[PDB]
Amino acid sequence: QTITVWSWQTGPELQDVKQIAAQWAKAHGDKVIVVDQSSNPKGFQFYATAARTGKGPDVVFGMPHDNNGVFAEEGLMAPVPSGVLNTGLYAPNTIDAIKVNGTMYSVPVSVQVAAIYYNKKLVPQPPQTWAEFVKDANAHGFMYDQANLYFDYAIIGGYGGYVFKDNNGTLDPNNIGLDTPGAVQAYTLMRDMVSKYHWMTPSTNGSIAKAEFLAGKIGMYVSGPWDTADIEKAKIDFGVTPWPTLPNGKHATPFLGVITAFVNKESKTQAADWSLVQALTSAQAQQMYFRDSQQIPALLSVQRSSAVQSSPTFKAFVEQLRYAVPMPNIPQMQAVWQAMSILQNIIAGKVSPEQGAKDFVQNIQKGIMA
Numbered sequence: 297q298t299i300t301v302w303s304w305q306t307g308p309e310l311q312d313v314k315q316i317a318a319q320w321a322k323a324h325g326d327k328v329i330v331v332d333q334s335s336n337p338k339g340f341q342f343y344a345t346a347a348r349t350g351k352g353p354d355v356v357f358g359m360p361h362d363n364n365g366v367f368a369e370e371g372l373m374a375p376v377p378s379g380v381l382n383t384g385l386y387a388p389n390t391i392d393a394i395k396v397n398g399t400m401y402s403v404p405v406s407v408q409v410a411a412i413y414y415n416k417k418l419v420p421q422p423p424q425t426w427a428e429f430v431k432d433a434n435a436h437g438f439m440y441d442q443a444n445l446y447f448d449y450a451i452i453g454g455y456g457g458y459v460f461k462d463n464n465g466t467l468d469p470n471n472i473g474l475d476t477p478g479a480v481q482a483y484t485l486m487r488d489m490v491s492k493y494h495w496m497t498p499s500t501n502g503s504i505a506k507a508e509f510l511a512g513k514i515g516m517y518v519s520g521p522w523d524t525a526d527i528e529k530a531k532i533d534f535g536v537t538p539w540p541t542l543p544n545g546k547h548a549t550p551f552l553g554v555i556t557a558f559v560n561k562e563s564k565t566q567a568a569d570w571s572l573v574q575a576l577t578s579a580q581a582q583q584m585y586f587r588d589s590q591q592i593p594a595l596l597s598v599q600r601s602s603a604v605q606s607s608p609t610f611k612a613f614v615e616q617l618r619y620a621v622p623m624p625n626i627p628q629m630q631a632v633w634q635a636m637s638i639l640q641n642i643i644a645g646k647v648s649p650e651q652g653a654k655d656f657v658q659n660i661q662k663g664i665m666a
């Protein structure tokens with residue numbers, strides 16, 4: 297009798313999802329319960345853990361697109377019905393992000409590109425070049441989730457590295473670019489931010505950086521709209537700006553992430569499920585999510601709205617979009633996330649950038665047991 301939605305988005309966006317769900321239930325009669333999985337210890341892949349034993353939700357809301365390759369390969373996702381998605385209403389990369397083996401398996405709700413969040417009280421105007429960045433980082437501090445590939449990939453790609461080679465829109469899982477000479481240069485810079493610039497210590501991570509930023513102790517840190525609520529609560533007069541150009545004069549290449557919503561193949565109420573997904577991902581819903589969290593809408597028409605076009609978050613997004621690399625969504629991407637722990641070793645100076653890079657790729661190539 298009840299439709300269960302698992303949401304990986306929390307805070308104000310979760311409140312909006314609950315509101316929309318309640319309105320939907322009011323018209324349809326079907327009861328709806330929205331569960332917050334954002335802090336679940338098993339992470340995003342918890343959907344697979346649950347669905348593999350037939351204990352998953354009816355609908356999933358707020359799932360980063362890279363995770364869906366696993367879910368789709370295992371047959372845990374209902375293909376999107378014909379006509380539900382109008383590809384012309386999104387940027388090309390946005391729709392490609394929700395396709396697995398050429399089939400659309402989820403609906404785009406938001407698009408994300410990590411950026412530098414800065415404290416205007418400490419840094420009035422944001423740095424754009426590495427030189428300017430060093431000056432501001434030295435003067436007021438800089439920290440981020442340095443050992444997390446999702447964020448530090450911006451540096452890797454900036455030096456020519458890549459995860460899986462993209463050719464003709466298709467990714468080659470065997471052609472990895474995380475150990476190229478360019479990637480090694482990037483890892484060297486990551487280590488340098490600790491050993492040379494002293495902006496961070498080997499223990500610095502995302503949690504610590506966020507805490508320091510909310511306390512007004514550092515002027516810059518790398519984040520996204522998921523922190524909007526907490527930043528405003530801390531009363532930080534924050535700004536958003538693109539990653540600065542790197543020491544090699546090139547632009548950093550942060551990942552492009554697409555937040556998606558989808559239906560469990562095992563759900564007994566597929567038609568109702570897609571109707572609920574439509575309500576949770578409509579232009580109106582996206583307008584709400586933006587107003588309350590600054591999450592950039594996946595729909596181009598909402599991106600072109602006055603509220604979005606005038607925002608600092610969108611300005612940074614549009615400035616980085618051309619350099620953003622969509623996260624791979626093939627199953628092998630999980631092997632990459634699972635082997636990135638070696639980045640910490642490089643940043644701590646326990647292993648050289650060259651050796652660490654080599655082992656990183658070798659570990660990825662071991663793959664994941666089916």
Ligand SMILES: OC[C@H]1O[C@H](O[C@H]2[C@H](O)[C@@H](O)[C@@H](O[C@H]3[C@H](O)[C@@H](O)[C@@H](O)O[C@@H]3CO)O[C@@H]2CO)[C@H](O)[C@@H](O)[C@@H]1O
Binds near residue numbers: 444
């Ligand atoms: O680190 C490995 C991890 O990288 C990618 O995850 C990023 C998310 O795509 C991105 O949205 C953001 O996650 C935030 C949630 O969306 C938000 O609701 C709330 O829970 O805070 C999160 C920040 O901790 O950042 C993560 C990276 O930390 C990739 O999509 C994952 O599959 C992968 O495991």
